[PDB]
Amino acid sequence: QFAKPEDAVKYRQSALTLMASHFGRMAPVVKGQAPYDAAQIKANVEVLKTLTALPWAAFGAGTEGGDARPEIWSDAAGFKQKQQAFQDNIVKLSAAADAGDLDKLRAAFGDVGASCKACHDSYRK
Ligand code: HEC
């Protein structure tokens, strides 16, 4: 869907940005600093879940640029793995949310977060 590499870059960064917001916004709740409303959380996770599938398609060959390390392309299999483990954690998050269990959510939240970090460690400049 992209004409220039710059456009894929702009797209993926935007998706990542949005996702960061949707995920990050739950930290105070998960930490107990904000009240917990199951329904609100559930809806937010639904959005997050949609957003989380988006970025991956904008890292095709020829989209080199931004803060993407070249290893994303040299080591595609490793990148796919990182991405899949991440989506899997999203699924867990989603299940915790659906169930309305703060403990579960809290734990899953940590798992997801570690997933973000794992990817960044190997593939983000
Ligand atoms: C690999 C599969 C990743 C996972 C999982 C997550 N992120 Fe990441 N992120 C990744 C890369 C390769 C990049 C650089 C993209 C580029 O082309 O510049 C990023 C970047 C971000 C950003 C910056 C967006 C911007 O404004 O430029 C943010 C805010 C970000 N990542 C956050 C983020 C969060 C919160 C994640 C988990 C919920 C997460 N990322 C996972 C690679 C990967």
Structure-token pair, residue 23:
């995920």
Q: Please count the other Cβ atoms lying within 10 Å of the Cβ belonging to residue 123.
A: 20
Domain with 109 in it: what CATH number?
1.20.120.10
Amino acid identity, residue 75? D
Residue nearest to atom 38 of ligand 1 (CA): 116
Q: Please tell me the total number of residues recorded for the chain in this structure.
A: 125
**Structural domain span for residue 109:** 2-125
Structure-token pair, residue 123:
């593939």
Instruction: List, as one string, the DSSP characters of 64-75.
Output: --TTB-THHHHT
Give 91's contacts (C-beta < 8 A, 6+ positions apart): 49
Give how many domains the chain has, as a whole number: 1
Structure-token pair, residue 89:
């954690």
Give 5's contacts (C-beta < 8 A, 6+ positions apart): 62, 63, 64, 65
Distance CA(101)–CA(71), nearest Å, equals 38
Distance CA(58)–CA(48), nearest Å, equals 17
Q: In terms of Cα–Cα distance, which of 34, 47, 52, 21 is closest to 102?
A: 34
Phi/psi for 68 (5° steps) reads: -80, 125
> How many A from CA of 123 to the centre of ligand 1?
9
Distance CA(81)–CA(20), nearest Å, equals 20
Residue nearest to atom 40 of ligand 1 (CA): 116
The approach used to solve this structure was: X-ray
